[PDB]
């Protein structure tokens, strides 16, 4: 059975291995808006497996992205290393490609994208121009990886 075949390329994130210092010692909870993420993420992969400890430290890692209108959060083709989340506002989806460049969707005070840049770098799948003013939530891949990696190195393994 099955299908969907065709030569497959190789995915690769940035090089990394902790073992350094661990200095440091959190953005505005916005609380009400807080629930939005802890709910819009309960569907994301790299989030579903997290520990409450890792989850917690992860919500704060996400900064606040603003955009008025006619603005472009993510251009189709861009490398991008950030995972975003609609908080407020409206955004349309231009799958600009195949030859032409139509429209294909509507995000509004809900809906997230870029989950694939939390693992490695990869070409944005579509331009997401803002029909907003709206506020988005972004999270750097690096910012994210460090949180998880630093935490997992502490875990004792069976050699």
């Amino acid at each position: 059975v099955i299908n969907r075949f065709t030569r497959r390329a190789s995915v690769c994130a940035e090089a990394y291995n902790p073992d350094e210092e661990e200095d440091d010692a959190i953005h505005p909870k916005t609380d009400d808006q807080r629930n939005r993420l802890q709910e819009a993420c309960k569907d994301i992969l790299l989030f579903k497996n997290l520990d409450p400890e890792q989850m917690s430290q992860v919500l704060d890692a996400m900064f606040e992205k603003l955009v008025k209108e006619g603005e472009h959060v993510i251009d189709q083709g861009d490398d991008g290393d950030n995972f975003y989340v609609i908080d407020r506002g409206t955004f349309d989806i231009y799958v600009k490609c195949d030859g032409v460049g139509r429209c294909v969707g509507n995000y509004d005070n809900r809906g997230s994208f870029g989950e694939l840049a939390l693992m490695y770098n990869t070409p944005r799948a579509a331009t997401i121009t803002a029909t907003s003013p709206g506020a988005l939530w972004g999270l750097d891949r690096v910012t994210f990886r460090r949180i998880i990696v630093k935490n997992n190195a502490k875990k004792r393994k069976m050699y």
């Binding site: 059975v1 497959r8 190789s10 995915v11 994130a13 291995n17 490695y120």
Partner: protein, 343 residues
């Protein structure tokens, strides 16, 4: 029989002493671009492409992988790049593709590998639909011995998939692409490989080891024998969800031993995955499925391949798809030269 047919302890002792030696002392600029005719692009990667080439003075054909230093630098995968060169030029194994020389210029990094007109197992696997357990097993015994080899040197290949498996003039595998090949003391982190082949420990940033290559083995054996990969879907995220869940179904034709050996290779609990237990690789060499295998013969390549590609003569570039030839010019200005001084 099993793991008692071939005695390999003394061999891996010398192999290790021979690898540490060549690794610590490479070779730089052992060739020149203006010495090779860029016949045709055999494959395109991320940082470059592998073009068939012919030395003007030798009239010899080789596979040439080209890498845009700036892009490498751009994407920050500059380390694996150097490791690919150094590690590859440092190994020797019957099923490992050989490098002849290398060099660099103002814009690119050149690795000149032997040419394997056989093509990727992927081209044949996709064409032949799927292979018999025998045929599939034949290739497997070869990976198992290369993984044993490579791992004993404390190396992790990190990129097993039909696409990187060359079938030569005798029907044997030539592993290519050492882009993720890294030396590992205890464990590593870089998330990398090829979607349908990534183990669960890599996807979730859990720190991994030589046990992710064994997982890839269970996938490979699967795709060879079944036709399709065990974990497949439109969205790679849809692929990662499944790999992680780990649940898989088996073609009704898959014999009972193939199903047993894959359940242990595609074991999510790595402290239970075959190749990573107390007996290491031996559990694999003693599994029922590998009951009919002659390891000593396999190693010496003294076994008739169940399939040998159609091979004409010098330069045959038919076993390979076609690719958008896009000329490459060096530069009057060197780019990121201090970040590749080892090459």
């Amino acid at each position: 029989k099993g793991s008692e047919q071939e005695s390999v302890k003394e061999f891996l002792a010398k192999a290790k002493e021979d690898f540490l030696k060549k690794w610590e002392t490479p070779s730089q600029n052992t060739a020149q671009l203006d010495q090779f005719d860029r016949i045709k692009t055999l494959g395109t990667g991320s940082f470059g492409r592998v073009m068939l080439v012919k030395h003007k003075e030798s009239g010899n054909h080789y596979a040439m992988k080209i890498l845009d230093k700036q892009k490498v630098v751009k994407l920050k995968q500059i380390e694996h790049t150097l490791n690919e060169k150094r590690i590859l030029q440092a190994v020797n194994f019957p099923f490992l593709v050989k490098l002849e020389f290398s060099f660099k210029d103002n814009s690119n990094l050149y690795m000149v590998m032997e040419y394997v007109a056989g093509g990727e197992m992927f081209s044949h696997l996709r064409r032949i639909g799927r292979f018999s357990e025998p045929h599939a097993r034949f290739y497997a015994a070869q990976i198992v011995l290369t993984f044993e080899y490579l791992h004993s040197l404390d190396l992790i290949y990190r990129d097993l998939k039909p696409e990187n498996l060359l079938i030569d003039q005798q029907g044997y595998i030539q592993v290519t692409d050492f882009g993720f090949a890294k030396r590992v003391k205890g464990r590593t982190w870089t998330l990398c490989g090829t979607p349908e082949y990534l183990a669960p420990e890599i996807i979730l940033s859990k720190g991994y080891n030589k046990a992710v290559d064994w997982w890839a083995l269970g996938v490979l054996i699967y795709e060879m024998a079944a036709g399709y990969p065990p974990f497949f879907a439109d969205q790679p995220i849809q692929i990662y969800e499944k790999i992680v869940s780990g649940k898989v179904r088996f073609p009704s034709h898959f014999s009972s031993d193939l199903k047993d050996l894959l359940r242990n290779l595609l074991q999510v609990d790595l402290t239970k995955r075959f190749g990573n237990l107390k007996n290491g690789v031996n559990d694999i060499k003693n599994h029922k499925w590998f009951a009919t295998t002659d390891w000593i013969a396999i190693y010496q390549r003294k076994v008739e391949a169940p399939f040998i590609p159609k091979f004409k003569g010098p330069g045959d570039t038919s076993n390979f798809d076609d690719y958008e030839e896009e000329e490459i010019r060096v530069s009057i200005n060197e780019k990121c030269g201090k970040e590749f001084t080892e090459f």
